[PDB]
Structure formats: structure tokens, C-alpha cells
Design an enzyme around this catalytic site. Structure first.
Site, PDB file in Angstrom:
ATOM      1  CG  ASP A 162      -7.709 -19.766  -7.199  1.00 39.45           C
ATOM      2  OD1 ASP A 162      -8.695 -20.057  -7.906  1.00 39.45           O
ATOM      3  OD2 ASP A 162      -6.554 -19.645  -7.655  1.00 39.45           O
TER       4      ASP A 162
ATOM      5  CB  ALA B   6      -2.761 -11.331 -12.460  1.00 39.78           C
ATOM      6  CG  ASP B   7       2.341  -9.392 -17.264  1.00 37.89           C
ATOM      7  OD1 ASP B   7       3.103 -10.332 -16.950  1.00 37.89           O
ATOM      8  OD2 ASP B   7       2.417  -8.797 -18.358  1.00 37.89           O
ATOM      9  CB  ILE B   8       4.482 -12.284 -12.916  1.00 36.52           C
ATOM     10  CG1 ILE B   8       4.187 -13.362 -13.961  1.00 36.52           C
ATOM     11  CG2 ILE B   8       3.525 -12.404 -11.739  1.00 36.52           C
ATOM     12  CD1 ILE B   8       4.440 -14.771 -13.472  1.00 36.52           C
TER      13      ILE B   8
END
EC number: 2.3.1.234
Lengths: 189, 325, 146, 75
Positions: free
Chosen positions: A107, A1-3
Site C-alpha cells: 500500500d 480503522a478509526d484512530i
RNA sequence: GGGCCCGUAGCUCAGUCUGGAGCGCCUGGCACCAGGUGGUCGAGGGUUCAAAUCCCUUCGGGCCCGCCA
């Protein structure tokens, strides 16, 4: 989930990729990253139909399991809700319609609501469609647990302002609140 | 050495231990309970504690004199109500038979303390998973706080009822762990991580619907096992990210399954952190943990009044005055 | 890479025979395309995204229409007399299309107006907070979802 | 529905010990399904339980039997 | 544009020509199995001694041939 934040000559792109998890089976890993990026893109786009502010989606790719969206140069909700209690009311606002249309952010927290010029709901990594009141109640329970574990010092006022905003925008709040009370007590005998 | 006797009556495994303040367990014994998987209007199954606590205590009497000990600690909570009451009454009886200080002890916090003593960890984020109590707990603001917990059914109870429908005799833990070694097809099940929490009823219902079609036993076993363990590992990972700690612990009976240990090892290797599990002598239900935590509570001056040692069947982890840093 | 040429021509004439001339191009309603951003995004995705239409230059219409369907995409974004937008790569093809259709060459039609706003909103069923140019950009972005 | 339980002990001291041990536990029930009095008389203990429900009454008396048996069997 | 199965308790699927079991749950206590109060069934139209139920049109959504400029 790196941005990754890039400045395209006319686009302010943020590429979010769902990195595989070594602890999980590669089969289930690929399946869940694909389904999760698909649901996140679809729901974060459909929430715009509500009027609820959200980042724009420039493109997606399930095979590469990435979503490249409109980047926002703001700060996290938790880093600003301490110095500003109105964004709890705004969270109530933009969650009222979201729950009204029966799409659930399983979430919900006070960490993924960016405040740069308005309140952006930047993450439906677990968004779902359901009419089930139990799912809505457990979503509310998760949000309450998150606000507890994050800002115990002001939990009471923060939750009261959030509920005020929510009841301002949502009208069936009484039944989900009573279900919240009935379910959050389900611990033991 | 302040000798203490601790008693464990939180679940179906009675435990009796005696420990010292230097950091070693003088004595520890456990005895489980095997029920017929169900019951209608049932008589309490915690009477096993009332039967084996005298036997374990007498055996401790043979191994060490009944007046040798100095303090007593009982598992005040959390746990099954009647069994908590049985261990409380036994501890009070021994305490003011020997006229010695008594203390109620948090079951979970005792799990963390023994996981700490048995290992090198200093202040780890615990994943306490057992037959009826699964939750991740952290030391924040001088308090053990629950971050992510189940909402419907614990992992141990989930595997228990899955083995019940597979009809693997209880305990079904190792039975499922081995039957899933040859699972082939990854059956479609509902993966769910609701924030920090987890729901488990949907997983079980989907498994039941699959078994109505009578699919392959080993395949569904492997599917449920991997699904549940991945969900638990995911909530543990996000809780760790919330804490930004450097050490994670796994405690509780279900930790006997080696695949959970390997999955957590892979997670920590990818996250460049270290991880531990207590040995079976301290990875189940035993009196040693309660004895150790009672000694820890009474050593730093936190005395316990006998009258207010009343138990709480819903004993939350954030209602304990932790003052031993 | 060859920079694709997009032209907004006012005063359009419908001529099906151009499509039978074997020319690599695509013609759409210029009052529906939001701006150069719309066509650029559609072209970029049709270049990158897995081909789904029966023709690449018809995949351009499929993309810029935001709909996999072609049977109604031709109805909804097909060329209309008065004003059109043509995307191509060949100067000779550009000249032939301009001769067969006619009109004036002015890209300034890529600018959006309130009538263009309303037309886009009623065409793409857009009802929500967001600037329409990038909202339509997004609406193009999510063709490849079930 | 009344239930009277009498428990005898080898000595008065043991009776006092079991009485004090079960005193807190009697008060340790957050909610009692029946009214209970738990009292000591020299070398005896009396458990007087008044209940409008038979099943909970039987559960409470069985639990008292369990705890008293454990207490007397500690020594 | 043309087929398919479809659309039935408030969440789970038959009940089709041949015209209610599920579930917070009223029904038991420390998951487990017996009771059910709670549907009259995509929308519209024609058939009907009785129509989701015989047929047609539309509405989504999933699926095949897609038929392109």
C-alpha cells in the site's frame, strides 16, 4: 480503522481499531481484520529492526482487533511533499532497506508517511513477506500510480528524487525498475 | 433533434444504436458471442461483428430511414483490437456513405454517460467491471481518470475461467451466481488489495489448487464470488474516500450479478451515500452509449476530424478532451 | 486496586527456598529491566492479556522477558546476586524477602545507563533506531503474535 | 511473401466510399505486422500486402476481408 | 527440556528404508493446451560400492507434553 488519540499520564497513545465492514461476510470480515491487525503490528514493529523510523507499539489485541501505538503529532506526507521535495528522497531511503529485507508494503503511497520531526512509515495494514520480484514490482507500480494520481503536476521530479534516494540506499534497483517497465505496460495487445 | 447512430465493437457483444440529443434512445440492439472457451493460434472471434453489424444496421434501416440520422459515433476504444477496427470501419463506411460527421468515442466514458442519463447521478465515481476491463474511474480536473484497476485479470474473465474449470457453459455469470447461493464453507483464498489496484491471478490459482483436491463445488463458488466482490468493493470504497464524492456507479456486464449490487447497497448504506446500476439495455455492450457520447461530444462544439478518428486498442481513459462538464 | 510494590535491591543473595515459601511475588535481574515503565507494561499486559504461563506471578516473568518460553526466560531474566528487582503486594512478604536476600532499598536503579543500554540491547536482540526504553516497551507489547 | 487482393463494387461512388472508409483504418493500425498498400482505381480497390510471416499475413488479409465485407454490406 | 512432520529449482511438492513434474516460459497465436534452457536438496559430523536419502548434533519456524521458579 478509526484512530483515537489519548494522552496517558506517561504514554502518548493512539488506538487504531479495524471497524468491521458490513458489505463483507462477518466470517471473512473477522478473519481479515484479525489477520490484518496481526500483520500490521508485526511488520510495523519489524521495520524498526531496519533502522527505518516507525511509530512505537504500546500494545495490541487481535481479539478486540486493535493496536494502540505511539501517537505522532505530525502532518501527512501529501500535505507537506508539495512544499518540500526532500521527503521523496527520504521515502526512497526508507523504502530501499524495506524492500532489501524482502518485506513489502503493498500500500505504498505518499499519504501515510508522516513528517513531524522525521519520516514515519505509519501503516503496514497490508505488509507481507515475500522474495517475489513480481510483488516488489507491483508495489512500485502502486506507489507510482499513487504519486501520479496525487501530484501529476510534479510526478516527474518527485519520482526521480524518490528513485535517487532508493538507489542510494538500495543496490538492486535496476532489475526492479526494468520489471516495473515490463509490467506496467501489461494492458492489452 | 440531431439523430446519431452509434456502434459498439469493444468486446464479444456487438451493439448498434441510434439516439437523440433530448436524452432518449430511439433504437438499441445487442447480440453476444459465445466461444468454445479457448483457442490455440486462434482465428479472430470478432468477425461476429462483421457478420451482425450489416444485419443490425439493416434492421435499423427498416425501423428508421438510412438518411434520417445526422451524426455517427463508433467505439474508438478501449477494447479488443480487431473488434474495435471492425466497428471503426463500419462507422466510417456509414459516415461517408451518408456524408455525415463521424466521431470516435471512449467505451468507458460512454458507459459513465449512459449510467448518468439512465439514473439521477450527476458526477458519479464509476466502477466499470466487465469481461476484460475492470477499473474505477473519476471525474477529476476535467478528465476521467483511472484510480484503481486490475493488474492480472478482470473480474469478468476471472468468473469466466472459473466457470470454465467448473465447466459451467458460457456465460457462467448467472450459473456461478446461483451455484454459489448454497455455498457453505468459506474456502481460504488470497485476499489482496494492492493500493487501489487488485491482483486476481492468485485467487484463481488458489481456487485451482483447491479443486485439485476436489472440494465442494458450491463452497468454492461462494468463496471466490465473495472474495472477488469484497476486493472490488474495498477498492471502490478507498477510491471513493480518495475522491470524497457523494455518488458511486456500477457499470458493465458483470453487474448482472445481484450480489454485487446488494454488497454495494450495504456499503453505501453504511456510508450514507446513494448508488445506481444501469439496466441491462445499458449495462452491457450496445451502440446506444457510443451514440449518446458522440452526440454529447459534438453538441458542445467538440468536432471530430475524420482522418484522425484512428482507434487505439490501449485507449486510456485520461486521453479524452472532456469539455461537457 | 492495590498499588503493586516494585523494589530495586542492590547486593542480592540467591535463595531458591523463598520460591517455596508460598509468596506471591516475582524477582528479576534489575540491570535488565529498563525502568518502572518496563515492569508497569509487563504487569498491565499480564493483567489484561490472556494468561499463558502456569502461574500469574510467573506470568509476570514471562511478560517482562518478552518471551512465552519459561525454560530460557528463567535463564535470561532470573535473579542474580548483586542487584535484583522484586515485584509484590504484601508488606510481610516484602519483609521476608528482604530478610532472606538482604541488601539496600533504592528504587533509583530504575534509571538507565550506557552499560544498561548495552545489556538490554544484547539481551533483547534490539538493533534499530529508537529510544531503548520504549523500544523495549514495544518488544514487551508483541508477545501475543505468532 | 506477396498477397494481392482485388475488390469490385457496383459503382465508382461506392468504391470511393469504401476506399475513404478503410483509408483511415489502414492508417489506424499502431503497428502493422506486414507492409500494406491500400489503393483505389475507379470502381476497384487493390490491397497489396508484403509479409515475411504467413500467419500474420493471413490474419491481415482476413481482417481486410472482414472490414471490406462490412463496408459493402452497410448499404 | 523431551516427541512430530518437516527444511529439495529462485518462488510448487515427491523423489527417504529400497541410498524431476512445477514456473514469464527456449519451445503459439489472438486465458488455452506441447516443448524446459534453467535443483543436485537446512548447516555440520561420522557410514557409504553409490547419502536430503543410515545415524547423530545444531539452526530457525509451525505444532504436543510443556517441567517451575
Amino acid at each position: 480503522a478509526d484512530i483515537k488519540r489519548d494522552s496517558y499520564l506517561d504514554f502518548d497513545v493512539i488506538i487504531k481499531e479495524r471497524v468491521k465492514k458490513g458489505y463483507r461476510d462477518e466470517r471473512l470480515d473477522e478473519n481479515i481484520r484479525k489477520s490484518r491487525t496481526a500483520r500490521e503490528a508485526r511488520y510495523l514493529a519489524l521495520v524498526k529492526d531496519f533502522g527505518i523510523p516507525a511509530p512505537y507499539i504500546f500494545d495490541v489485541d487481535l481479539d478486540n482487533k486493535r493496536i494502540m501505538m505511539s501517537y505522532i503529532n505530525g502532518k501527512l506526507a501529501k500535505d507537506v511533499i508539495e512544499d518540500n521535495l526532500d521527503i521523496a528522497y527520504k521515502i526512497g531511503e526508507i523504502v530501499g532497506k524495506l524492500h532489501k529485507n524482502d518485506v513489502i508494503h503493498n500500500d505504498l503511497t505518499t499519504s501515510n508517511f508522516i513528517f513531524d520531526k522525521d519520516l514515519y512509515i505509519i501503516d503496514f495494514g497490508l505488509g507481507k513477506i515475500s522474495n517475489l520480484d513480481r510483488d516488489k514490482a507491483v508495489d512500485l507500480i502502486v506507489f507510482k500510480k499513487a504519486v501520479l494520481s496525487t501530484h501529476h503536476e510534479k510526478f516527474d521530479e518527485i519520482w526521480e528524487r524518490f528513485l535517487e534516494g532508493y538507489k542510494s540506499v538500495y543496490d538492486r534497483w535496476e532489475i526492479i525498475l526494468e520489471l516495473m517497465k515490463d509490467v506496467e505496460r501489461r494492458a492489452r495487445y | 433533434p440531431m439523430i446519431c447512430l452509434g456502434l459498439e465493437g469493444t468486446a464479444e457483444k456487438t451493439g448498434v444504436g441510434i439516439v437523440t440529443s433530448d436524452g432518449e434512445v430511439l433504437f438499441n440492439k445487442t447480440i453476444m458471442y459465445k466461444p468454445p472457451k479457448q483457442g490455440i493460434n486462434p482465428r479472430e472471434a470478432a468477425d461476429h461483428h462483421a457478420e451482425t453489424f450489416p444485419k443490425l444496421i439493416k434492421e435499423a434501416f427498416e425501423v428508421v430511414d438510412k438518411n434520417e440520422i445526422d451524426l455517427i459515433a463508433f467505439s474508438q476504444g478501449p477494447g479488443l483490437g480487431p473488434s474495435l477496427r471492425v466497428t471503426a470501419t463500419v462507422a466510417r463506411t456509414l459516415s461517408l456513405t451518408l456524408k455525415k460527421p463521424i466521431i470516435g468515442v471512449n467505451h468507458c466514458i460512454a458507459h459513465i454517460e449512459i449510467g448518468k442519463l439512465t439514473t439521477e447521478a450527476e458526477d458519479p465515481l464509476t466502477l466499470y467491471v466487465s469481461g476484460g476491463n475492470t477499473q474505477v474511474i473519476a471525474y477529476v480536473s476535467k478528465k476521467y481518470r483511472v484510480f484503481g484497476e486490475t493488474l492480472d485479470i478482470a473480474v469478468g474473465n476471472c468468473l469466466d475461467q472459473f466457470a470454465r474449470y467448473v465447466n459451467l457453459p458460457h456465460p457462467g455469470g448467472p450459473y456461478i451466481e446461483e451455484l454459489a447461493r448454497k455455498g457453505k464453507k468459506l474456502v481460504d483464498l488470497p485476499y489482496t488489495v494492492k493500493g487501489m489496484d487488485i491482483a486476481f491471478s492468485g485467487l484463481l490459482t488458489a481456487a485451482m489448487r483447491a479443486y485439485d483436491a476436489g472440494e465442494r463445488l458450491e463452497d468454492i463458488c461462494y468463496s471466490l464470488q465473495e472474495y472477488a466482490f469484497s476486493m472490488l468493493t474495498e477498492i471502490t470504497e478507498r477510491a471513493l474516500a480518495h475522491t470524497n464524492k457523494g455518488e458511486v456507479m456500477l457499470v458493465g456486464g458483470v453487474a448482472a450479478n445481484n450480489r454485487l449490487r446488494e454488497m454495494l447497497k450495504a456499503m453505501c448504506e453504511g456510508q450514507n451515500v446513494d448508488f445506481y446500476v444501469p439496466p441491462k439495455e445499458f449495462c452491457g455492450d450496445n451502440g446506444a452509449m457510443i451514440a449518446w457520447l458522440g452526440l454529447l461530444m459534438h453538441k458542445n462544439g467538440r468536432w471530430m476530424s475524420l482522418d484522425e478518428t484512428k482507434i487505439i486498442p490501449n485507449y486510456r481513459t485520461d486521453m479524452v478532451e472532456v469539455n461537457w462538464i | 486496586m492495590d498499588p503493586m510494590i516494585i523494589r530495586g535491591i542492590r547486593g542480592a543473595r540467591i535463595n531458591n527456598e523463598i520460591f517455596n515459601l508460598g509468596l506471591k511475588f516475582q524477582i528479576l535481574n534489575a540491570d535488565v529491566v529498563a525502568t518502572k515503565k518496563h515492569v508497569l507494561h509487563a504487569i498491565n499486559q499480564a493483567k489484561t492479556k490472556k494468561p499463558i504461563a502456569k502461574s500469574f506471578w510467573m506470568e509476570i516473568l514471562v511478560r517482562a522477558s518478552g518471551q512465552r518460553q519459561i525454560h530460557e526466560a528463567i535463564k535470561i531474566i532470573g535473579a542474580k546476586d548483586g542487584n535484583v528487582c522484586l515485584i509484590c503486594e504484601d508488606e510481610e512478604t516484602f519483609r521476608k524477602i528482604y530478610e532472606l536476600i538482604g541488601g539496600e532499598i533504592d528504587d533509583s536503579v530504575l534509571e538507565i545507563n550506557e552499560d544498561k543500554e548495552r545489556l538490554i540491547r544484547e539481551i533483547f536482540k534490539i538493533r534499530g533506531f529508537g529510544n531503548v526504553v520504549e523500544r523495549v516497551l514495544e518488544k514487551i507489547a508483541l508477545i501475543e503474535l505468532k | 511473401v506477396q498477397a494481392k487482393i482485388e475488390i469490385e463494387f457496383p459503382s465508382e461512388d461506392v468504391a470511393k466510399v469504401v476506399y475513404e472508409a478503410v483509408l483511415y483504418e489502414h492508417l489506424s493500425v499502431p503497428y502493422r505486422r506486414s507492409e500494406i498498400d491500400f489503393k483505389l482505381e475507379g470502381k476497384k480497390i487493390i490491397l497489396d500486402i508484403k509479409a515475411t510471416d504467413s500467419s500474420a499475413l493471413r490474419g491481415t488479409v482476413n481482417s481486410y476481408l472482414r472490414w471490406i465485407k462490412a463496408a459493402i454490406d452497410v448499404i
